Coordinates of C-alpha atoms in Angstrom, one line a residue:
Chain A
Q1 CA 187.8 19.5 -85.8
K2 CA 185.8 22.3 -84.2
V3 CA 184.2 23.3 -87.5
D4 CA 183.5 19.6 -88.4
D5 CA 181.7 19.2 -85.1
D6 CA 179.8 22.5 -85.8
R7 CA 178.7 21.1 -89.2
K8 CA 177.8 17.8 -87.6
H9 CA 175.5 19.5 -85.1
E10 CA 174.1 22.0 -87.6
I11 CA 173.0 19.2 -90.0
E12 CA 171.2 17.5 -87.1
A13 CA 169.5 20.8 -86.1
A14 CA 168.3 21.3 -89.6
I15 CA 167.0 17.8 -90.0
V16 CA 165.1 18.0 -86.7
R17 CA 163.8 21.5 -87.5
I18 CA 162.6 20.8 -91.1
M19 CA 161.5 17.1 -91.2
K20 CA 159.3 17.9 -88.1
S21 CA 157.0 19.7 -90.7
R22 CA 157.9 17.8 -93.9
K23 CA 157.0 14.4 -95.5
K24 CA 158.9 11.0 -95.3
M25 CA 161.9 9.4 -97.1
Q26 CA 162.1 5.9 -98.6
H27 CA 165.8 5.5 -99.7
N28 CA 167.2 8.9 -100.6
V29 CA 164.3 11.4 -100.8
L30 CA 164.8 13.8 -97.9
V31 CA 168.6 13.8 -98.1
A32 CA 168.3 15.8 -101.4
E33 CA 166.2 18.4 -99.6
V34 CA 168.6 18.6 -96.6
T35 CA 171.5 19.0 -99.0
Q36 CA 169.7 21.7 -101.0
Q37 CA 168.9 23.6 -97.8
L38 CA 172.7 23.4 -97.1
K39 CA 173.9 24.0 -100.6
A40 CA 174.8 27.6 -99.9
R41 CA 176.5 26.6 -96.6
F42 CA 179.1 23.9 -97.4
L43 CA 179.6 20.6 -99.2
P44 CA 176.8 18.1 -98.8
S45 CA 179.3 15.4 -97.5
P46 CA 177.1 12.4 -98.4
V47 CA 179.0 9.9 -96.4
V48 CA 179.0 12.0 -93.3
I49 CA 175.3 12.8 -93.4
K50 CA 174.5 9.1 -94.2
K51 CA 176.5 7.9 -91.3
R52 CA 175.0 10.6 -89.0
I53 CA 171.3 10.1 -89.9
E54 CA 171.4 6.5 -88.7
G55 CA 172.8 7.4 -85.3
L56 CA 169.5 8.8 -83.9
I57 CA 167.7 5.4 -84.2
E58 CA 168.8 4.4 -80.7
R59 CA 166.1 6.5 -79.0
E60 CA 162.8 8.4 -79.6
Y61 CA 161.9 11.6 -81.5
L62 CA 161.9 10.3 -85.1
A63 CA 164.1 7.3 -84.6
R64 CA 163.8 6.7 -88.4
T65 CA 163.7 3.0 -88.3
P66 CA 165.6 1.5 -91.3
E67 CA 163.6 -1.7 -91.6
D68 CA 160.3 0.2 -91.1
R69 CA 161.1 3.0 -93.6
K70 CA 157.6 2.9 -95.1
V71 CA 156.4 5.4 -92.5
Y72 CA 158.2 7.6 -90.0
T73 CA 157.0 8.5 -86.5
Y74 CA 155.4 12.0 -86.9
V75 CA 155.5 12.5 -83.1
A76 CA 157.6 14.2 -80.5
Chain B
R1 CA 101.5 -7.3 -125.2
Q2 CA 103.9 -9.0 -122.7
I3 CA 103.1 -9.0 -118.9
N4 CA 106.0 -8.2 -116.4
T5 CA 104.2 -7.7 -113.0
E6 CA 102.1 -11.0 -112.9
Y7 CA 102.8 -14.1 -115.0
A8 CA 106.3 -13.2 -116.3
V9 CA 107.9 -12.8 -112.8
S10 CA 106.0 -15.7 -111.4
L11 CA 106.8 -18.0 -114.4
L12 CA 110.5 -17.2 -114.2
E13 CA 110.6 -17.7 -110.4
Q14 CA 108.8 -21.0 -110.6
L15 CA 111.1 -22.2 -113.4
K16 CA 114.1 -21.2 -111.3
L17 CA 112.6 -23.1 -108.3
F18 CA 112.0 -26.2 -110.5
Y19 CA 115.6 -26.0 -111.6
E20 CA 116.8 -25.8 -108.0
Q21 CA 114.6 -28.8 -106.9
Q22 CA 115.6 -30.8 -110.0
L23 CA 112.0 -31.1 -111.1
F24 CA 110.6 -31.9 -114.6
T25 CA 114.2 -32.1 -116.0
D26 CA 114.7 -34.3 -119.1
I27 CA 118.2 -33.3 -120.2
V28 CA 121.5 -33.3 -118.3
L29 CA 124.8 -31.8 -119.5
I30 CA 128.0 -33.7 -118.8
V31 CA 131.0 -31.3 -118.4
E32 CA 134.2 -33.1 -117.5
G33 CA 132.3 -35.4 -115.1
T34 CA 130.1 -32.6 -113.7
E35 CA 126.3 -33.0 -114.1
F36 CA 124.0 -30.1 -114.9
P37 CA 120.4 -31.2 -115.0
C38 CA 118.3 -28.6 -116.8
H39 CA 115.4 -28.2 -119.3
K40 CA 115.3 -28.2 -123.0
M41 CA 112.9 -25.2 -123.3
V42 CA 115.1 -22.7 -121.5
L43 CA 118.2 -23.9 -123.4
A44 CA 116.3 -23.5 -126.7
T45 CA 115.0 -20.0 -125.9
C46 CA 118.3 -18.7 -124.5
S47 CA 121.0 -20.4 -126.7
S48 CA 120.8 -20.6 -130.5
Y49 CA 122.9 -23.8 -130.5
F50 CA 120.8 -25.9 -128.0
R51 CA 117.7 -25.3 -130.2
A52 CA 119.5 -27.0 -133.1
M53 CA 120.9 -29.5 -130.5
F54 CA 117.4 -30.7 -129.5
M55 CA 115.2 -29.9 -132.6
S56 CA 117.3 -31.1 -135.5
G57 CA 116.8 -34.8 -136.0
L58 CA 119.9 -36.7 -135.0
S59 CA 121.3 -39.2 -132.5
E60 CA 121.6 -36.5 -129.7
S61 CA 118.1 -35.2 -129.9
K62 CA 116.8 -38.5 -128.4
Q63 CA 119.6 -38.7 -125.8
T64 CA 119.0 -38.3 -122.0
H65 CA 122.8 -37.9 -121.3
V66 CA 124.8 -35.6 -123.6
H67 CA 128.6 -35.3 -123.2
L68 CA 129.4 -31.7 -124.1
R69 CA 133.1 -30.9 -124.2
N70 CA 135.3 -27.9 -124.8
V71 CA 133.3 -25.9 -122.3
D72 CA 134.2 -24.8 -118.7
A73 CA 132.0 -25.9 -115.9
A74 CA 131.8 -22.6 -114.2
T75 CA 131.0 -20.7 -117.4
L76 CA 128.2 -23.2 -118.3
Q77 CA 126.8 -22.9 -114.8
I78 CA 126.7 -19.1 -114.9
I79 CA 125.1 -19.2 -118.4
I80 CA 122.5 -21.7 -117.1
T81 CA 121.7 -19.5 -114.1
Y82 CA 121.5 -16.4 -116.3
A83 CA 119.0 -18.3 -118.5
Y84 CA 117.0 -19.3 -115.5
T85 CA 117.0 -15.9 -113.7
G86 CA 118.1 -13.2 -116.2
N87 CA 121.0 -11.9 -114.1
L88 CA 124.6 -12.3 -115.4
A89 CA 126.7 -10.9 -112.5
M90 CA 129.9 -11.1 -114.4
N91 CA 133.3 -10.5 -112.8
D92 CA 136.4 -8.9 -114.4
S93 CA 138.5 -12.0 -114.6
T94 CA 136.4 -14.8 -116.2
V95 CA 135.1 -12.5 -119.0
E96 CA 137.3 -14.2 -121.7
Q97 CA 136.2 -17.7 -121.0
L98 CA 132.6 -16.6 -120.6
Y99 CA 132.6 -14.9 -124.0
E100 CA 134.3 -18.0 -125.6
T101 CA 131.6 -20.3 -124.2
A102 CA 128.9 -17.9 -125.2
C103 CA 130.2 -17.8 -128.8
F104 CA 130.4 -21.6 -128.8
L105 CA 126.8 -21.9 -127.5
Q106 CA 125.6 -18.9 -129.6
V107 CA 123.8 -17.1 -126.8
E108 CA 123.1 -13.7 -128.3
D109 CA 122.1 -11.7 -125.2
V110 CA 125.0 -12.7 -123.0
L111 CA 127.3 -12.3 -126.0
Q112 CA 126.1 -8.7 -126.4
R113 CA 126.5 -8.1 -122.6
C114 CA 130.0 -9.5 -122.6
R115 CA 130.9 -7.5 -125.7
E116 CA 129.7 -4.3 -124.0
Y117 CA 131.6 -5.1 -120.8
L118 CA 134.8 -5.8 -122.8
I119 CA 134.5 -2.7 -124.9
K120 CA 134.0 -0.7 -121.7
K121 CA 137.2 -2.2 -120.1
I122 CA 140.0 -1.5 -122.6
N123 CA 141.8 0.5 -119.9
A124 CA 145.6 0.2 -120.3
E125 CA 147.0 -3.3 -120.6
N126 CA 144.5 -5.8 -121.9
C127 CA 144.2 -3.8 -125.1
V128 CA 146.5 -6.0 -127.2
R129 CA 145.2 -9.2 -125.4
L130 CA 141.6 -8.4 -126.1
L131 CA 142.4 -7.3 -129.6
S132 CA 143.9 -10.7 -130.2
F133 CA 140.8 -12.2 -128.5
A134 CA 138.5 -10.3 -130.9
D135 CA 140.7 -11.4 -133.8
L136 CA 140.2 -15.0 -132.8
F137 CA 136.4 -14.6 -132.3
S138 CA 135.2 -12.1 -134.9
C139 CA 133.7 -9.1 -133.2
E140 CA 133.6 -5.9 -135.3
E141 CA 132.9 -3.5 -132.4
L142 CA 135.6 -5.0 -130.2
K143 CA 138.0 -5.2 -133.1
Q144 CA 137.6 -1.5 -134.0
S145 CA 137.7 -0.3 -130.3
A146 CA 140.8 -2.4 -129.5
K147 CA 142.4 -1.2 -132.7
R148 CA 141.9 2.4 -131.8
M149 CA 143.1 1.9 -128.2
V150 CA 146.2 0.1 -129.5
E151 CA 146.9 2.9 -132.0
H152 CA 146.7 5.3 -129.1
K153 CA 148.7 3.5 -126.4
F154 CA 150.9 0.8 -128.0
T155 CA 152.5 3.6 -130.0
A156 CA 153.7 4.9 -126.6
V157 CA 154.5 1.5 -125.0
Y158 CA 155.4 -0.9 -127.9
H159 CA 156.9 -3.3 -125.4
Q160 CA 153.9 -5.4 -124.1
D161 CA 154.6 -9.1 -123.7
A162 CA 151.2 -10.0 -125.3
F163 CA 152.0 -7.9 -128.3
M164 CA 154.7 -10.3 -129.4
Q165 CA 152.2 -13.2 -129.9
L166 CA 150.0 -11.8 -132.7
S167 CA 148.8 -13.1 -136.0
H168 CA 150.3 -11.7 -139.2
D169 CA 147.0 -10.1 -140.4
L170 CA 146.3 -8.2 -137.2
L171 CA 149.9 -6.9 -137.1
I172 CA 149.7 -5.8 -140.7
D173 CA 146.5 -4.0 -140.0
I174 CA 148.0 -2.3 -137.0
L175 CA 151.2 -1.2 -138.7
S176 CA 149.8 -0.2 -142.1
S177 CA 147.2 2.0 -140.4
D178 CA 147.7 5.7 -140.5
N179 CA 146.5 6.1 -136.9
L180 CA 149.9 5.5 -135.1
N181 CA 150.2 8.0 -132.3
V182 CA 154.0 8.3 -132.7
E183 CA 155.9 11.6 -133.0
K184 CA 158.9 9.8 -134.6
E185 CA 159.2 7.2 -137.3
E186 CA 162.0 5.1 -135.8
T187 CA 160.0 3.8 -132.8
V188 CA 157.7 1.8 -135.1
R189 CA 160.7 0.5 -136.9
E190 CA 162.3 -0.8 -133.8
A191 CA 159.0 -2.2 -132.5
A192 CA 158.7 -4.2 -135.8
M193 CA 162.3 -5.3 -135.5
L194 CA 161.9 -6.5 -131.9
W195 CA 158.7 -8.2 -133.0
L196 CA 160.9 -9.9 -135.7
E197 CA 164.0 -10.6 -133.5
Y198 CA 162.4 -12.9 -130.9
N199 CA 160.8 -15.1 -133.7
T200 CA 163.3 -15.3 -136.6
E201 CA 163.7 -18.0 -139.3
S202 CA 160.1 -18.8 -138.5
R203 CA 158.4 -15.7 -139.9
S204 CA 161.0 -14.7 -142.6
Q205 CA 158.3 -14.2 -145.2
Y206 CA 156.2 -12.2 -142.7
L207 CA 159.5 -10.5 -141.8
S208 CA 159.8 -9.3 -145.4
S209 CA 156.1 -8.3 -145.4
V210 CA 156.5 -6.2 -142.2
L211 CA 159.8 -4.8 -143.7
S212 CA 157.8 -3.6 -146.7
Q213 CA 155.0 -2.3 -144.4
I214 CA 157.3 -0.1 -142.3
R215 CA 158.4 1.5 -145.7
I216 CA 161.5 3.2 -146.9
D217 CA 161.6 6.1 -144.3
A218 CA 162.6 3.6 -141.7
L219 CA 163.8 0.9 -144.1
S220 CA 166.9 2.9 -145.1
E221 CA 168.3 3.4 -141.6
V222 CA 169.7 0.2 -140.0
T223 CA 167.4 -2.7 -141.1
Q224 CA 169.8 -4.0 -143.8
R225 CA 172.8 -4.4 -141.4
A226 CA 170.7 -6.0 -138.6
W227 CA 169.2 -8.4 -141.1
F228 CA 172.7 -9.2 -142.5
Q229 CA 173.7 -10.1 -138.9
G230 CA 170.6 -12.2 -138.4
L231 CA 169.9 -13.7 -141.8
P232 CA 169.9 -17.5 -142.3
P233 CA 172.9 -18.9 -144.2
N234 CA 172.6 -19.7 -148.0
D235 CA 169.9 -17.1 -148.6
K236 CA 170.2 -15.2 -151.9
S237 CA 166.8 -14.4 -153.3
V238 CA 165.9 -12.9 -149.9
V239 CA 168.5 -10.3 -150.6
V240 CA 166.9 -9.6 -154.0
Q241 CA 163.5 -9.2 -152.5
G242 CA 164.7 -7.0 -149.7
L243 CA 166.7 -4.7 -152.0
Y244 CA 163.5 -4.0 -154.0
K245 CA 161.8 -2.1 -151.1
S246 CA 163.7 1.1 -151.6
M247 CA 161.9 3.0 -154.4
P248 CA 158.2 1.9 -154.6
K249 CA 155.2 1.8 -152.3
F250 CA 154.2 5.4 -151.9
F251 CA 156.3 6.9 -149.1
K252 CA 153.9 9.3 -147.4
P253 CA 153.9 11.3 -144.1
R254 CA 152.3 9.7 -141.1
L255 CA 149.6 11.2 -138.7
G256 CA 151.2 10.9 -135.3
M257 CA 153.8 13.5 -136.2
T258 CA 151.1 16.2 -136.0
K259 CA 151.2 16.6 -132.2
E260 CA 151.1 20.4 -132.2
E261 CA 151.2 21.9 -128.7
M262 CA 147.9 23.9 -128.5
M263 CA 145.5 25.3 -126.0
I264 CA 142.1 23.7 -125.2
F265 CA 139.4 26.2 -124.2
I266 CA 135.9 25.5 -122.8
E267 CA 132.8 27.6 -122.4
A268 CA 133.4 30.1 -125.2
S269 CA 130.9 32.6 -126.6
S270 CA 128.7 30.5 -128.8
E271 CA 128.3 31.9 -132.4
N272 CA 124.7 30.5 -132.6
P273 CA 122.1 32.0 -130.1
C274 CA 120.6 28.5 -129.9
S275 CA 123.8 27.3 -128.1
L276 CA 125.1 28.9 -124.9
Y277 CA 128.7 27.8 -124.6
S278 CA 131.3 26.1 -126.8
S279 CA 134.7 24.5 -126.6
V280 CA 137.4 25.8 -129.0
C281 CA 141.2 25.6 -129.4
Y282 CA 144.0 28.0 -130.4
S283 CA 147.3 27.2 -132.2
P284 CA 150.3 29.1 -130.9
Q285 CA 152.4 28.3 -134.0
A286 CA 149.8 27.9 -136.8
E287 CA 148.0 31.0 -135.5
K288 CA 144.6 29.4 -136.1
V289 CA 141.5 28.8 -134.0
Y290 CA 140.1 25.3 -133.9
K291 CA 136.9 24.0 -132.4
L292 CA 135.9 21.0 -130.3
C293 CA 132.6 19.2 -129.8
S294 CA 130.9 19.7 -126.4
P295 CA 131.1 16.5 -124.4
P296 CA 127.5 16.5 -123.1
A297 CA 126.4 19.2 -125.6
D298 CA 124.1 20.5 -122.8
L299 CA 126.0 20.5 -119.5
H300 CA 128.4 23.3 -118.5
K301 CA 130.7 24.3 -115.6
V302 CA 133.2 21.5 -116.1
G303 CA 136.8 21.1 -115.1
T304 CA 139.8 20.2 -117.3
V305 CA 143.0 18.2 -116.7
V306 CA 145.8 17.1 -118.9
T307 CA 147.9 14.1 -118.0
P308 CA 151.6 13.9 -119.1
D309 CA 150.5 11.5 -121.8
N310 CA 148.4 14.3 -123.4
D311 CA 144.9 13.2 -122.4
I312 CA 141.8 15.3 -121.9
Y313 CA 139.3 14.6 -119.2
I314 CA 136.0 16.3 -118.1
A315 CA 134.4 15.8 -114.7
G316 CA 131.4 17.2 -112.8
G317 CA 129.3 20.0 -114.2
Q318 CA 125.8 21.3 -114.1
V319 CA 123.0 20.9 -116.7
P320 CA 119.6 22.7 -116.8
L321 CA 116.7 20.5 -115.7
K322 CA 114.8 21.3 -118.9
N323 CA 111.6 21.1 -117.0
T324 CA 108.7 21.3 -119.6
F325 CA 120.7 23.7 -113.4
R326 CA 121.0 20.3 -111.9
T327 CA 124.5 18.9 -111.0
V328 CA 125.7 15.6 -112.6
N329 CA 128.8 13.7 -111.5
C330 CA 129.4 12.3 -115.0
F331 CA 132.8 11.7 -116.4
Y332 CA 134.1 12.0 -120.0
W333 CA 137.3 11.6 -122.0
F334 CA 138.2 13.3 -125.3
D335 CA 139.2 11.2 -128.3
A336 CA 142.3 12.5 -130.1
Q337 CA 141.2 11.2 -133.5
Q338 CA 137.4 10.6 -133.5
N339 CA 136.6 14.1 -132.2
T340 CA 134.1 12.7 -129.8
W341 CA 133.8 12.0 -126.0
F342 CA 133.6 8.5 -124.5
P343 CA 132.2 8.5 -121.0
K344 CA 133.9 6.7 -118.1
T345 CA 133.1 5.7 -114.6
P346 CA 131.0 8.5 -113.0
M347 CA 132.0 10.1 -109.7
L348 CA 130.3 9.5 -106.3
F349 CA 129.5 13.2 -105.6
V350 CA 127.9 15.8 -107.9
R351 CA 130.6 18.5 -107.9
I352 CA 130.4 22.0 -109.3
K353 CA 133.5 23.0 -111.3
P354 CA 135.9 20.4 -109.9
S355 CA 139.6 20.9 -109.9
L356 CA 141.3 17.8 -111.4
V357 CA 145.0 17.2 -110.8
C358 CA 147.1 14.4 -112.3
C359 CA 149.9 12.8 -110.3
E360 CA 151.6 9.4 -110.4
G361 CA 149.2 8.4 -113.1
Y362 CA 146.2 9.2 -110.8
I363 CA 143.6 11.9 -111.3
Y364 CA 142.9 13.9 -108.2
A365 CA 139.8 16.0 -107.9
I366 CA 140.2 18.6 -105.3
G367 CA 137.1 20.5 -103.9
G368 CA 134.4 21.9 -106.2
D369 CA 131.2 21.7 -104.1
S370 CA 130.9 18.0 -103.3
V371 CA 128.0 18.2 -100.8
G372 CA 128.4 20.7 -97.9
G373 CA 126.1 19.0 -95.3
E374 CA 128.8 16.4 -94.5
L375 CA 130.6 16.9 -91.1
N376 CA 133.9 17.5 -93.0
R377 CA 132.9 20.1 -95.6
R378 CA 136.5 19.8 -96.7
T379 CA 137.0 16.5 -98.5
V380 CA 138.5 15.2 -101.7
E381 CA 138.2 12.2 -104.1
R382 CA 140.8 10.8 -106.5
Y383 CA 140.6 8.6 -109.6
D384 CA 142.4 5.5 -110.8
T385 CA 143.4 5.6 -114.5
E386 CA 144.4 1.9 -114.4
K387 CA 141.7 0.2 -112.3
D388 CA 139.0 2.7 -113.4
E389 CA 137.6 3.4 -109.9
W390 CA 137.3 6.2 -107.4
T391 CA 139.2 5.8 -104.1
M392 CA 138.6 8.0 -101.1
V393 CA 141.7 9.7 -99.6
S394 CA 142.6 12.0 -96.7
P395 CA 140.2 15.0 -96.7
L396 CA 141.1 18.6 -96.9
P397 CA 142.4 20.4 -93.8
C398 CA 140.3 23.6 -94.4
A399 CA 137.2 24.2 -96.5
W400 CA 137.9 26.6 -99.4
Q401 CA 136.0 28.0 -102.3
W402 CA 137.2 29.2 -105.8
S403 CA 140.5 27.5 -105.1
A404 CA 143.2 26.2 -107.5
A405 CA 145.4 23.1 -107.5
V406 CA 148.5 22.1 -109.4
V407 CA 151.1 19.3 -109.2
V408 CA 154.8 19.9 -108.7
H409 CA 157.6 17.3 -108.3
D410 CA 155.0 14.5 -108.1
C411 CA 153.3 16.2 -105.2
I412 CA 149.8 17.6 -104.8
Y413 CA 149.6 21.4 -104.2
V414 CA 146.3 23.2 -103.7
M415 CA 146.1 27.0 -103.4
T416 CA 143.4 29.1 -101.8
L417 CA 142.9 32.7 -100.7
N418 CA 146.0 32.7 -98.4
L419 CA 146.8 29.1 -97.3
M420 CA 148.4 26.2 -99.1
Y421 CA 148.7 22.5 -98.2
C422 CA 151.0 19.9 -99.8
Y423 CA 149.1 16.5 -100.1
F424 CA 151.5 13.6 -100.3
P425 CA 149.6 10.7 -102.2
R426 CA 152.1 8.0 -101.0
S427 CA 151.7 8.7 -97.2
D428 CA 148.1 10.1 -97.7
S429 CA 149.0 13.1 -95.5
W430 CA 148.8 16.9 -95.8
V431 CA 152.0 19.0 -95.2
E432 CA 151.6 22.6 -94.1
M433 CA 153.7 24.8 -96.5
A434 CA 153.6 28.6 -96.4
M435 CA 151.0 31.4 -96.2
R436 CA 150.6 34.2 -98.7
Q437 CA 150.7 37.7 -97.4
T438 CA 147.9 38.8 -99.8
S439 CA 144.3 37.5 -99.7
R440 CA 143.2 37.1 -103.3
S441 CA 140.6 34.7 -104.7
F442 CA 138.9 33.9 -108.1
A443 CA 142.4 33.1 -109.5
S444 CA 144.3 30.1 -110.9
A445 CA 147.9 28.9 -110.6
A446 CA 150.3 27.3 -113.1
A447 CA 152.9 24.6 -112.4
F448 CA 155.9 25.6 -114.6
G449 CA 159.1 23.8 -113.7
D450 CA 159.7 23.8 -110.0
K451 CA 157.9 27.1 -109.3
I452 CA 154.2 27.8 -108.8
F453 CA 153.0 31.1 -110.3
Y454 CA 149.8 32.3 -108.7
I455 CA 148.6 35.0 -111.0
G456 CA 145.6 37.3 -110.5
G457 CA 143.1 37.6 -107.8
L458 CA 140.6 40.0 -106.3
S459 CA 144.2 41.7 -110.4
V460 CA 147.8 41.6 -111.5
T461 CA 149.3 40.0 -108.4
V462 CA 152.4 37.9 -109.3
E463 CA 153.3 35.7 -106.4
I464 CA 156.0 33.2 -107.2
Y465 CA 156.5 30.2 -104.9
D466 CA 159.3 27.6 -104.9
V467 CA 159.1 24.1 -103.4
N468 CA 162.8 24.1 -102.4
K469 CA 162.9 27.8 -101.2
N470 CA 159.5 27.3 -99.5
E471 CA 158.8 31.1 -99.8
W472 CA 156.4 33.5 -101.5
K473 CA 157.8 36.5 -103.4
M474 CA 156.7 39.1 -105.9
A475 CA 158.4 39.7 -109.3
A476 CA 156.6 42.6 -111.1
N477 CA 153.2 43.8 -112.4
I478 CA 152.0 42.7 -115.9
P479 CA 151.9 45.8 -118.3
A480 CA 148.1 46.1 -118.5
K481 CA 146.2 49.3 -119.6
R482 CA 144.4 50.9 -116.6
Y483 CA 140.6 50.9 -116.2
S484 CA 140.7 47.2 -117.4
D485 CA 139.9 43.7 -115.9
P486 CA 142.7 41.4 -117.0
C487 CA 141.4 37.8 -117.2
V488 CA 144.9 36.3 -116.5
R489 CA 145.6 32.7 -117.6
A490 CA 149.0 31.2 -116.7
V491 CA 150.1 28.0 -118.5
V492 CA 153.3 26.4 -119.8
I493 CA 154.1 26.9 -123.5
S494 CA 157.0 25.0 -125.2
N495 CA 158.9 24.7 -121.9
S496 CA 158.6 28.4 -121.4
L497 CA 156.4 30.3 -118.9
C498 CA 153.9 32.5 -120.7
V499 CA 150.5 34.1 -120.0
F500 CA 147.3 34.7 -121.9
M501 CA 145.4 37.8 -120.8
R502 CA 142.5 39.8 -122.1
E503 CA 141.7 43.5 -121.2
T504 CA 138.3 45.0 -121.2
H505 CA 137.4 48.7 -120.8
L506 CA 134.3 50.8 -121.0
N507 CA 132.8 51.1 -124.5
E508 CA 135.8 49.2 -125.8
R509 CA 136.3 45.8 -127.5
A510 CA 138.2 43.0 -125.9
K511 CA 141.8 42.3 -127.1
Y512 CA 143.6 39.0 -126.9
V513 CA 147.4 38.9 -126.5
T514 CA 150.0 36.5 -125.1
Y515 CA 153.3 37.6 -123.6
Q516 CA 156.6 35.8 -123.0
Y517 CA 157.8 36.1 -119.4
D518 CA 161.4 35.7 -118.3
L519 CA 162.4 34.3 -114.9
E520 CA 165.4 36.6 -114.2
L521 CA 164.0 39.7 -116.0
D522 CA 160.6 39.8 -114.2
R523 CA 159.1 41.2 -117.4
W524 CA 156.4 40.0 -119.8
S525 CA 157.9 40.5 -123.3
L526 CA 155.5 40.9 -126.2
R527 CA 155.5 37.4 -127.7
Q528 CA 152.4 37.5 -130.0
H529 CA 149.2 39.5 -130.2
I530 CA 146.2 37.4 -131.1
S531 CA 144.4 39.1 -134.0
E532 CA 140.7 39.5 -133.8
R533 CA 140.4 38.4 -137.4
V534 CA 140.9 34.8 -136.4
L535 CA 139.7 34.7 -132.8
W536 CA 136.5 36.2 -131.5
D537 CA 135.4 37.0 -127.9
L538 CA 135.5 34.1 -125.4
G539 CA 133.7 35.3 -122.3
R540 CA 134.4 35.3 -118.5
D541 CA 134.0 31.7 -117.3
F542 CA 136.3 30.3 -119.9
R543 CA 139.2 28.0 -118.9
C544 CA 142.6 27.3 -120.5
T545 CA 144.8 24.2 -120.5
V546 CA 147.8 23.0 -122.5
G547 CA 147.6 19.9 -124.7
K548 CA 148.5 18.4 -128.0
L549 CA 145.8 17.8 -130.7
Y550 CA 145.5 16.7 -134.3
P551 CA 144.5 19.4 -136.9
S552 CA 143.1 16.9 -139.4
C553 CA 140.7 15.2 -137.0
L554 CA 139.5 18.6 -135.6
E555 CA 137.8 21.2 -137.7
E556 CA 138.4 25.0 -138.0
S557 CA 135.9 27.3 -136.4
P558 CA 134.2 29.4 -139.1
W559 CA 133.9 33.1 -138.0
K560 CA 133.9 36.3 -140.0
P561 CA 137.1 38.5 -139.2

């Protein structure tokens, strides 16, 4: 459980450190990059990352709106 | 002599005013209930049908009201206003009906204008549609141009909806021609089949004709079994006639199979002292040097780009003023069979040595001395290969000179002295990538696989960058003799990274040799040394690009070993 929580926070740290200087994603564009960056760390765990990327929409700092996925908020 | 600054303009304007006020009119055209009062003189001088309509003695010559049918109201109105003012102002949608009405009314000037407009607008999709249009209304220029465009593109698409509805003669001319741009002989077979599967039992005789046309090389594969599945019942002589197309009718090789991967070079050392530069080609496999015709024949300092569909484009350049070097924003495209250059829509800024990059089917021209006096001296301009227009995009972050740009993973990458920015065409935004630790200019980069190989600069600097790794690293130094100036050229060859370099010493002759480089070995193995008996000196400002060409259409460059 501890290492699972560690991975769950590490993926969020990576996604907020990298996509703050990268492009946008329509359906599954940036997930490939975030898995490639973590290829040498552990398994991609597609279901876990898919369930976790949609949890940040509740507030600011790149909410990543699902309906308005055409453009993402490139702000802080 | 004809006046043009006194009576001509005044007479034309007064005739237009009389038309507006409905004055001195004696003939009115009835078009599905719409009235078009006009004059007989203008109709006679413009249209070659109205002159016979009003001069030849019949019942309609002495007829105030004439009910002309099979003509559109808007097209007739635009024809009348063109006759009354000389301006056509044609759009891109109503060209077909306008041409049909012009052909019916036999108005030669507007017919020629529409013919030129249509021959200039065979872009990507209306090729088969306008080819059928020209087959319906005989037009040799349009027919030939559309035939060439079809032989170039349909051989790569062969699925257009309009292509299904074609007359037998046009399809026979298309298929029997030896200009099919196909690297394989089964694609034309399946195209003919699908053309004969949606309409079967109606064109069975034409089915047999097309079956004979496609010839034995593709007739002996599957056609018999598919026809057995799809033949009408109680058909016996059809089997006899189909079995006959195995031996005869001169099985010969096609032309599209000769898509040899070669290298297109520009601004070479001209053999004649009258000329200054020339464009030539080299064959990696045939070990021969071919030549190409200069697009403007006088303008130089051009940039090259190759689309994934193996197309050659030329943009920008400078030409001497020939008073008793001015920059021109003209555009050109190389014909793969006619060995000529058909111009296209010119640019909006006169660039010097533009860098053209293809991505998502769009041509992106990055930098290359657009103007300089503009507030943002760092701007760009792209091209639309489908709409045939130039669209302004997000400008460059920083102003750079002697830069290079490539495309990787459907993303725009431009390289300068030490900085690099990733333009994303979809979001029209620039992404900051990484910064090189070495400041080198006057060099180019190659987009091989998923890695950018920036080679040279002032040398032999080999800086490899990866999109995923987002990092710059060194591999090795190219084995080059000392006291030399290696003109490095990096380009993809046969899905393998290779280089083309030339070394020059003092009181020594230039040598051309290409090496094979390995990713994990970091070494340029000796692949092939270009003998001087076939290739002569090129120069310093020459450029290299990868593309497929036809040996038969091109001509060998004569030069003494």
